[PDB]
Amino acid sequence: KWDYDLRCGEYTLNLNEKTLIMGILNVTPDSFSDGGSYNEVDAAVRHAKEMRDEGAHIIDIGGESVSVEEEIKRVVPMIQAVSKEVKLPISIDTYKAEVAKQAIEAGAHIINDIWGAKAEPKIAEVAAHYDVPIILMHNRDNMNYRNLMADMIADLYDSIKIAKDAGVRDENIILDPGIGFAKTPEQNLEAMRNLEQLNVLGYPVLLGTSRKSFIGHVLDLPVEERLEGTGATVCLGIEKGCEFVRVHDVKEMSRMAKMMDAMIGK
Amino acid sequence: KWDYDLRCGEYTLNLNEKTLIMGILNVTPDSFSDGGSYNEVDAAVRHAKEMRDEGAHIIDIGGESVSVEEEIKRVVPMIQAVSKEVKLPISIDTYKAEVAKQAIEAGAHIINDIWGAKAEPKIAEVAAHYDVPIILMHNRDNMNYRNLMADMIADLYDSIKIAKDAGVRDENIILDPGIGFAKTPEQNLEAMRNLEQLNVLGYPVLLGTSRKSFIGHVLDLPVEERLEGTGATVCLGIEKGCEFVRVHDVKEMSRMAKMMDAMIGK
Ligand SMILES: Nc1nc2ncc(COP(=O)(O)OP(=O)(O)O)nc2c(=O)[nH]1
Numbered sequence A, B: 001k002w003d004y005d006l007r008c009g010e011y012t013l014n015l016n017e018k019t020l021i022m023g024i025l026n027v028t029p030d031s032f033s034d035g036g037s038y039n040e041v042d043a044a045v046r047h048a049k050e051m052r053d054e055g056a057h058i059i060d061i062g063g064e065s066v067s068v069e070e071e072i073k074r075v076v077p078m079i080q081a082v083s084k085e086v087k088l089p090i091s092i093d094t095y096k097a098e099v100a101k102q103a104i105e106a107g108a109h110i111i112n113d114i115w116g117a118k119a120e121p122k123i124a125e126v127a128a129h130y131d132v133p134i135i136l137m138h139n140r141d142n143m144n145y146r147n148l149m150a151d152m153i154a155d156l157y158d159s160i161k162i163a164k165d166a167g168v169r170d171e172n173i174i175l176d177p178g179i180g181f182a183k184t185p186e187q188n189l190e191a192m193r194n195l196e197q198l199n200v201l202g203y204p205v206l207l208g209t210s211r212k213s214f215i216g217h218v219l220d221l222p223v224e225e226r227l228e229g230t231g232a233t234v235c236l237g238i239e240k241g242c243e244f245v246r247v248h249d250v251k252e253m254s255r256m257a258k259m260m261d262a263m264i265g266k
């Protein structure tokens, strides 16, 4: 079904054997430090290691959940430590070109842009240069949709044209519906319900619903009681053709993904 | 979508608002007793109560996991205690006509037959008389299929004709693919993968995959580590149109069902 693999420097991800699990890295920053200090980076490394043992195929690393020069000093040491100590592709969760650049020099393999190259188009130029996969997430500054899905796909196309114009190859493009961004709770559900529509664009899709507020809205449960809700969204995502899921609870979701895969015949 | 409700005596189950959760009752029998004793029945009642609090809509009660007169002395006291103390429809997990009869006299509302009225055709006569819903599960004494799904549906039809010939009304018929019965691990997965085919028969479908061995075969995990695997099967079942799921882990599955429902628009 996918006639290429996702090339990631020293690592290679097959898109046909299994749903790939992207594990969300904890990055609790030390008050009292610029970045680089031992407690932050060690806890970050130990967590990456956990997730690798629990079935993660990618470790996703952020610098904000804030000043570009600040964000780089936080995230660079983490990428360096994790990439040396954990044999797994790292994605860098940024929408900033300079952050993406340093993150890749530091060892990051994949760019993860929640603004789909619309916040900082040069990020696509960075991606094109280092020849790395980039995730283009659906996002916008408003919820004024005429037709949710039609508009998401349009909006996603606008991200693709920016990526391609800057030289990004189709094989390095991943799409993401951006669940939990620029969407009402009911719109998030509608997108989940129609996620298979994204497949017509011809690119691998990553789904990120982990613990997000729309699960809370449905279940009336707080962030730490959302594991069954998240699992449902992962399952439905995989039945609808997603190639990756981005999740906090790697052990649990790994298992649900693995059972879904066997059922749907991936 | 369903133009009737499932009538169950004093209780009424809507088939359109939500996936209905059937909770599997613990029925650890006392060595040293015929049935009726306080420790068995109390633990059974306390468990029914738990499941009711965790989101169950039906309590399913068995007498074997053994002598018909023996099976009745175990199960009758349980039905009597649970039905008085827990305001929920009870189904009786038996393929024996006499057991089904006493269970209903004792307070049971729904018959649950893992042999789909083929082991004891008179069970359909019982069902017809008390005018109660009966679950006809797919089952057979061999795994020699020509075409798994085609044959299951055929086999299910043979159960329906027996139910109808004995006077059972369409509205009281529920079907169940019998996952984990007369099926190799790979056949169980194939059935999951094609469960929506059962919908053409026009009856509500109950799915029972809880902790079953085919999840173990996929995940290489023992019975008590199968919650994420079960959840996956429930999710995929609900996406494929199931009206009920029969589960041990009522709290967790209730939540996954509830999130699936919101996503698929039930
Ligand atoms: N590609 C992609 N990246 C993302 N980054 C952040 C969040 C949400 O961030 P937040 O809820 O602040 O924390 P966490 O990163 O733990 O989800 N969601 C996505 C997503 O769905 N897709």
Ligand SMILES: Nc1nc2ncc(COP(=O)(O)OP(=O)(O)O)nc2c(=O)[nH]1
Pocket: B024, B062, B065, B093, B112, B113, B114, B135, B137, B176, B178, B179, B206, B207, B208, B209, B210, B212, B246, B248
């Ligand atoms: N309608 C229906 N009834 C059933 N009864 C027993 C079991 C399997 O029984 P077992 O694994 O012995 O124990 P448990 O009853 O806890 O599943 N599965 C079904 C099922 O899938 N559907």
